[PDB]
Structure formats: structure tokens, C-alpha cells
């Protein structure tokens, strides 16, 4: 029913702490795969944090808040998902003692944490170095960084390629910020089989819809594309259109009219001399015929999302009513119209030998979803940099810097206001630690050394994954988008600040 007092507080903290506990063995280069079972049927074999926590229903309110943190974070940057959860926990946990043990009110611990966040954020931008968003080589060895710790690493280079080759493709600066809608303009397409490398980033689209009529062009050299909303069949009246006939030879009259309007429609289209007509709706058998000899291949039923991406790699602006069909609505700038038959399943291409279609190949419909998600992380950190050319010391280095500059300051602040501040510092340290642990090396040992080396000797010094020894980032490098280090710490400290505002929990609508 009800639970006021530290009772509340505790269960919240423990709850939140437990959330972390699950995916903590998923943060690191040697991170394991949490094969989860969804209710609907299938499975999820991913190790990408947010993709795990999504597939786990929780009860305790805090555990629900803690769980959605991984989502809002997966919405800002594509990466840094697992990290925010672990941090968001350790913060609450590291407050636990001064929260009750040292009887500090939640207002005070909040007043400090909100303060320690800003200072902490400084130390992030302070250690961050900028980068050439255009230097293909830098972007690659940047995207590569956030491809490690995932099944997609055995082709790491191959991945950053398909990543950049797609981030830049749908990009479109615009200024009067840079707009990169990976979502609506980079439709992926996972096709079972082949090899990983056998996957490319076609600059166009790929529909499996075949051709409306047999004897129709399998591939127009340079096709003239015409995209339209409206269907291709005899329309009807949006009023009480009811016909009364007693005039004998009138049946034939009307029944004919239908053929007649389908004709007109074919005309208006055929007019601008098209070779490829792709409509979102249907295609009357009649209309097929008049578009056959009219000289063009037809494609019926294609999703809006599928269509509007075509209209960016054909230029062919989509148009509804045909009696208004302009000639500006061309089909210029569009290579071939291949129709490769991929294992008993016909496809259609529209490459040009603004929106690309990443086509992945692996070894199962299952294994592909691993790739797709892994790729998304790549293609997202690429976008981040595109809109914030700043990077942060990976290997948990940044995380340790903030640990010290804060630890130092806290110790030199004096007042009850110090303890909560001190905790944010002590908290931060958990990431290089989770890393060192999931590496196998001795946490107490490596950290003391990493922390010390940090205290003076440079701040771009994190821990090396497969190794387990402290290395300098600059050295073997593994910087990550500075944006990630923003959110991870922004919302984590917020989460903590929210849950700490709770002193009572109640049940009933």
C-alpha cells in the first residue's frame, strides 16, 4: 500500500541500483550478449543496452524511471546507452550513505548534485578535442571506435564505410544547421545470406515489388520516373452517385465510360513521356495495357516512406491528380532500373550507377538484426560528430577526469554541501572500473594507477579493453562523440535528482 520514510528512499535506490546490475556486464569491449525472450515470440540476441532493457518489464517505479533513462539517451546520441544506466545508478547508490547515514536532507543533496553536474560538464568539454567532420579517415577511425564491443567488429572497417557512405549521402546542410535524417532517408534492407562484405550502400532504393505486366521492361537505361499518390483505376463519386437505367443500349454506354477514364489517366501520365511509373496505390489491368504500349514499366503498391525516398534519388516529385501532372515532375538523375531476382524473390533497383538504401547481408535473418542495430550505433555517432565536431577521451578516460577535478573541488568546498558533491566524483569512477573488471584486471590496482596518472600526467588516459592495462587514449585512440559524454552525465544526474525527491510511494489510480 504505502511506504513513507527512508523505507521509500531505500527501495528506490536499491531498485535503481539493481537496474544497473543487469547490463553492467554489457559495457566494455568484451561485453556479453543478453539473449532476451520477447512475449510475441522471437528473440533478441543483442548486447546493445537499450535494446535489452526494452525487452524487460519492471515493477518498482524507480526501476521504471531508471529503465526509460536508457531510452531518452538512445534518442539524443545513438551510443552511450549502457553507460548512462550504470552511471545513473552509481550516482543514486553513492548518495545512499550521506542520504540517510549522514542524515543530509534530499533538498541539500540535490542542490549539490545539480551544482556538481555543471562543474563536471565543464571538465568534459575541457578535455574534449575537436575533429574534421569532413576528413574521411578521421570519421572512419571515429565511427570505428563505437563499433567495437559489438558482433559487427569482425568487419569494423567495412562498417564505418557503409556508415559514412550513408551519413553523408542523406545529409543536406541548409543555412539561412546540417539536418541528417538517417531515419526517413536511409531505409535499411536486411537480406538473408551471402557474406557480410557482400553488402553495399546502394545510392537509390530497393523494392521487391516486380512489374505490373509480363512483357514490360525489366530495366530502362535512363528511366523517366513518375511518382504518384492516386491509384490507377476507375474512380467513383464522393456523393450519392446512383445511376438509373431503363434506356436499353445504355448499359454498354456507361460500362464503356470506365475504360474511357482509365484511358485519359494513362494519357496524362504517358504525356510527359515516362518509362517508369511508380504509384502508391493500385493499377487497373486496363491502365497496365495503355501504359504498356504507352512505353513504360509500372510498379503498384509502394509505401509512402518507400516512395518519398525514391523522389529524392529520381528528383521526380510525387503528384496526385494527373490533369495537373507537370513536366517538371521528371525522372532525371536516376541510373538504371535493374530487377535482380534474389533467390526466388524479385527485386527492383534504382541506383544511379539525397537518400541511400543500406543493404546488409550476413548469415541469417537473426544475425542481421544484430548488424542493423550495431550499424545504427555507428551511423548515429557519425551524425553526432557531423553536428558537434568534438570528441572525448574514450576508454573511460573522460569519466575519470571529471572524477578528479570534481573530487579535488569537493574536498576544497567545506560544508555539508560537500558530501553529495564528493559522491558525484566517487560515482563517475565506476565506468573505468566496470571496464577494467569486464577486462579481467584488478580494479583497485589499475584504477589507483589510472587515477593517479590522471591526477597529473594527462587526462586522455583510459583503460584498454582486451588488454586490461591503463593506456593513454591519444596512443591507440578511442575517442567518442563529446555529445555522448554530455547526455550520459546530464540525465544520469537528473535521474538521481528526481528519485531523491521521493520520500513516499503510493498505490491506486
Amino acid at each position: 500500500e504505502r511506504t513513507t520514510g527512508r523505507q521509500a528512499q531505500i527501495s528506490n535506490i536499491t531498485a535503481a541500483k539493481a537496474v544497473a546490475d543487469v547490463i553492467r556486464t554489457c559495457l566494455g569491449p568484451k561485453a556479453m550478449l543478453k539473449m532476451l525472450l520477447d512475449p510475441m515470440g522471437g528473440l533478441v540476441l543483442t548486447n546493445d543496452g537499450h535494446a535489452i532493457l526494452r525487452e524487460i518489464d519492471v515493477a518498482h517505479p524507480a526501476a521504471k524511471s531508471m529503465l526509460e533513462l536508457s531510452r531518452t539517451q538512445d534518442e539524443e546520441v545513438g551510443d552511450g546507452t549502457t553507460t548512462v544506466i550504470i552511471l545513473a545508478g552509481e550516482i543514486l547508490a553513492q548518495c545512499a550513505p550521506y542520504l540517510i547515514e549522514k542524515n543530509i536532507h534530499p533538498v541539500i543533496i540535490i542542490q549539490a548534485l545539480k551544482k556538481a553536474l555543471t562543474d563536471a560538464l565543464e571538465v568534459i568539454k575541457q578535455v574534449s578535442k575537436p575533429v574534421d567532420v569532413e576528413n574521411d579517415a578521421a570519421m572512419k577511425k571515429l565511427i570505428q571506435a563505437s563499433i567495437g564491443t559489438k558482433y559487427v567488429i569482425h568487419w569494423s572497417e567495412k562498417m564505418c564505410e557503409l556508415a559514412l557512405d550513408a551519413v553523408k549521402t542523406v545529409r543536406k546542410d541548409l543555412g539561412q544547421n546540417f539536418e541528417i535524417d538517417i531515419k526517413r532517408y536511409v531505409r535499411v534492407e536486411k537480406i538473408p545470406g551471402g557474406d557480410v562484405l557482400d553488402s553495399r550502400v546502394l545510392k537509390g532504393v530497393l523494392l521487391n515489388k516486380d512489374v505490373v505486366h509480363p512483357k514490360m521492361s525489366r530495366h530502362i537505361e535512363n528511366p523517366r520516373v513518375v511518382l504518384l499518390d492516386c491509384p490507377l483505376e476507375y474512380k467513383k463519386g464522393e456523393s450519392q452517385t446512383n445511376i438509373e437505367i431503363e434506356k436499353e443500349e445504355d448499359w454498354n454506354r456507361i460500362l464503356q465510360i470506365e475504360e474511357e477514364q482509365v484511358q485519359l489517366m494513362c494519357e496524362q501520365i504517358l504525356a510527359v513521356r515516362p518509362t517508369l511509373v511508380i504509384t502508391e496505390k493500385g493499377v487497373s489491368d486496363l491502365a497496365q495495357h495503355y501504359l504498356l504500349k504507352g512505353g513504360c514499366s509500372v510498379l503498384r503498391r509502394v509505401k509512402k516512406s518507400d516512395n518519398n525516398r525514391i523522389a529524392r534519388v529520381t528528383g521526380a516529385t510525387i503528384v496526385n491528380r494527373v490533369e495537373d501532372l507537370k513536366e517538371s515532375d521528371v525522372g532525371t538523375n536516376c541510373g538504371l532500373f535493374k530487377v535482380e531476382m534474389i533467390g526466388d524473390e524479385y527485386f527492383s533497383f534504382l541506383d544511379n550507377c539525397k537518400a541511400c538504401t543500406i543493404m546488409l547481408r550476413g548469415g541469417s535473418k537473426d544475425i542481421l538484426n544484430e548488424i542493423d542495430r550495431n550499424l545504427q550505433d555507428a551511423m548515429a555517432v557519425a551524425r553526432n560528430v557531423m553536428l558537434s565536431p568534438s570528441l572525448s577521451p574514450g576508454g573511460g578516460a573522460t569519466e575519470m577526469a571529471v572524477s578528479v577535478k570534481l573530487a579535488e573541488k569537493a574536498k576544497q568546498l567545506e560544508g555539508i554541501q560537500q558530501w553529495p558533491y564528493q559522491a558525484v566524483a566517487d560515482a563517475m569512477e565506476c565506468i573505468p572500473r566496470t571496464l577494467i573488471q569486464n577486462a579481467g584486471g584488478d580494479p583497485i590496482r589499475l584504477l589507483s594507477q589510472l587515477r593517479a596518472k590522471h591526477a597529473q600526467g594527462n587526462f586522455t588516459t583510459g583503460i584498454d579493453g582486451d588488454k586490461g592495462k591503463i593506456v593513454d587514449m591519444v596512443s591507440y585512440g578511442i575517442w567518442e562523440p563529446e555529445v555522448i559524454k554530455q547526455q550520459s552525465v546530464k540525465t544520469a544526474i537528473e535521474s538521481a535528482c528526481l528519485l531523491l525527491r521521493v520520500d513516499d510511494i503510493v498505490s491506486g489510480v
Binding site: 538473408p192 509480363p214 512483357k215 446512383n242 436499353e248 443500349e249 489491368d285 526466388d344
Partner: protein
Amino acid sequence: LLNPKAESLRRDAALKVNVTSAEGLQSVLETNLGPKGTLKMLVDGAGNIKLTKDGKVLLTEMQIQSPTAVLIARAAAAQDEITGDGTTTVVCLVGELLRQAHRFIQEGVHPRIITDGFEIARKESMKFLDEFKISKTNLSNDREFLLQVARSSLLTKVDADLTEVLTPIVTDAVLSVYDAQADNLDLHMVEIMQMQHLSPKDTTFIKGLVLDHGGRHPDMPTRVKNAYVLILNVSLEYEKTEVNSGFFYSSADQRDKLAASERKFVDAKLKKIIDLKNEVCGMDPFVIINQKGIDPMSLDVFAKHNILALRRAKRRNMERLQLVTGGEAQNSVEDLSPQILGFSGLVYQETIGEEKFTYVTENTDPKSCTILIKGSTHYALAQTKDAVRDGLRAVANVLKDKNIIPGAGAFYIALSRYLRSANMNKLGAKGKTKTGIEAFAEALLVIPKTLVKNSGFDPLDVLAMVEDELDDAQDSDETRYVGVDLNIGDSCDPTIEGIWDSYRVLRNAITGATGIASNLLLCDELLRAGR
């Protein structure tokens, strides 16, 4: 830690399970592997008996609940859905792979080291294949070689004598649709009409296209010898007003006048065709097929002029028939030219009691055949088709990929050995990562062993023989392909027996099984949350 409900095998228990299951599924399909496999007869909850020996069949035909057994099944189906062959091999490969790996996990080696090894071995395996394959000239018309591919991928599911019956019927079909001079082919153009009555040994190869829907009218042509063929697709039956309509006669017989007025729209478009069978052969030297319907009154008109009229045809037959005859798929009847009908020699409608069966025999430019599968029962008619498909997509693959691989597990016993002595003096690998490639190597010996395990002769022994009769022609130089003879128990030359594994299968089997296994091994917790 947790929240109520939601179970989860963790730590090495989760891996224990994963491997457990895999090993299991493996053993259950090992039986239907090799020509000397086992024919299971499974019946569903309705009593539909069905025979098989095709891993895929048995696999999608069962209800599996083991999560690991699914990820392995799905990846195996995804293989018969691309290479059309080797669905069985891949389940063994991911099984045996996990066993071989679990041995070094069980001793301590972190799984990530056995997975690293796998990828390394995988590449080296796929390199070795490209050096192992046998580029066969695009030169088709080598029906001899192809008939060995037909039998190869057939004995894997056929009544022996029936292998010899289907071996040609398949090859000729693939060829018949394949377009010489490199190019390509779409198997969809090989209709697979199947009919009951008379055993599955009686099945036949039609160079044309056989269909069901015959001329449904008494006074129809029992057999149109030598004639044109019209590819029709416009509704030759009564229709209605696309907008709400109704008749309203005020006069006694005005009724009647309006009666014919409805049918007249038919004859309008129906005349445009009937005079075509006049305007061409209007004096005897003929048949329309039509995808849509043909009502009674209309069937009369066609039966009147002796025009075999078929209705409701398989819509994909538009394209198939448009090759069996040549004539354009005539959608509308308006712009209908007499110089666009198709041509077929004998086009006869074999009536089999209530069942109609129109054939499109004698063609000039076939380009689209029909494998007529005969068979007394449904269970056989089923399996026979599942044998043809798994052996037709098998020949057409020998063409697509202009390479082939010696069977009898030659490639496996090879790659296996190679990797062993490779890293011994390669070190082009890693530190303790040698384990994983060592496993992968030993793993591969699934197929050869299992191949004989099914035959009979002791796996361990006969495989030992191949390992000997092999290096024999190595210590004497020269290349000699070696495989397991599943009849004697000695080794033999796959190429000489006529035993071939399609290249694209092996390329999508190894990269596949590893993808699963190697991703399974990195699994450390099986959740089950989210009501």
C-alpha cells in the same frame, strides 16, 4: 538480481543450455544426412502423413520451443531460402561447432577467444574454398556434367530408381529456362504441376506447360492439333456497374430489350477476338487461355467456333505461357493484333474424370517447361516435389556459380587438416586464440563422420583412411581429391563418382553456422521478462 516473475539461465548455465540444445538439434537431423540417410514419417495433429529426409522439411514441419533451437532453425531455413540446399549440414555445423568449442571453454578459455578463432578460421576457410573450387566452363550443353549434379543433389531424398527418373527431368528443366551466353534464369518459369494417380516414378518432363483448368464446355475441342494460342487477361464474363446502378423497365417486353443489353458489353469485346480466329486460320491449318473468367453464354460462343476456352489461369502463367508460345500477354482486347497470338503444336486437354488437364505440347521457342509430378498419394506427391526443388535449385546453382566442389566431404576433410598444420607454422593468428581455430578445424569433420555414421562403416576408421589415401598423393605430390565412399568404407575420388556440393551452398553454410554458433558462445544470460 530481479523483479517478480521472469526467469533467466545465467553464468555458464546459459551457455550450458545453448550448447545443450544445439548438440541436440544436431543429433536429431544427423539421421537424414547423406544419401545413406533415414526416411522419417511425421504426421501432424490432423493425420497428414508426410515423408522426408530433407532437414528443412523436418525442421519447419515441427514445433520447436527451445530458443537456441530456433535461432539455429531460422538460420538454417535462411539457408534453404538462398542456396536451396544444405539445410541439414548447417545445423550439424553449428552443433558440432559448439561442442568442439565447449571443450576449451570447459577448460577455462574465455569464449571470446574461441569466437575470435572462429572468425579467423572462417576467413581462411572461405579463402581455401576459392582455391579448392573447380571453375567449370559456362559452357552448358555439357548435360553430362549436369546430370551428375542432378543425381548428386537427388540421392539425398530419392527412391534410388526414381533418382534416374528425375535426374534428367530436372536438368533439362533448368536448361530449358536458363538463357545461354552467361546471362541468367528465373526458376519460376518451370511450372511444377503435380497430379495424383500413378506412382511418383511415372512423373514426366514437359517441354511446354501443363495446366488444370480445361475447356469447360461439352462441344469443346478435345484436342486442338497445331494452332495459335491467345494469352488473354480481360474479363470474358458478366460484369456490373462500377457505380451503383439499376434497371427500371415500364414496358412488358422493355424488360427483354434490357436483358440482352447487359450481355452485349461482353460480345463487344468478345467479337474483337472471335473474328481473330477467322482472320487467322479461318479455313483450318485457335485456343484462348485467359487469366480471368468466362461465363456460360460466352463459353458457347467459343465452343460454337471450336475455340478451346480456358478460364482462371494461374496469373504467373501469363509470363510462363508468353514463352511457351511467344504471344504477348494480351491484357485488353481493343488494340488486339492477330500477329501477337502465340504458337504451339499439339495442345490437347487430357480429361482425367472431372479433372481437366490441358497441355501446350510442341513449341518452337520453349524457354519455360513444366515438370509434371505424378504420384498415387499425397504424401509422395509432397516429398517428390520437395526433392525436385532441392535438386533443381541445385543444378541452376551450378550455373549461377561457375564453380563446383567435390562431394563426399572432400572440402571438409581438407580445410580441417589444412587449418591444423597451418597455424602450427602460420602464427598468422593470435595468442591463445589458436584454440578456437583448432576447434573450428576439428569441428568441420562433422559431415564426413556423420556421412558414414549414417552409412554404417565406423566414422573414426573410414575417416582415418581418407586421411591416409590422401597424404599418400601428397608425399608423392600431385593433387588427388579424396572423399568417403559410403558404400564400401574406403576413400574415393568424389569427382570420379559424380558427387558434387554446389559452391554457393558451402559458401553460405560455413559463414552461416559460424554466425550463429560464434554469436551463441558470446551469450551469457537468457532473459525471459516483459509480460
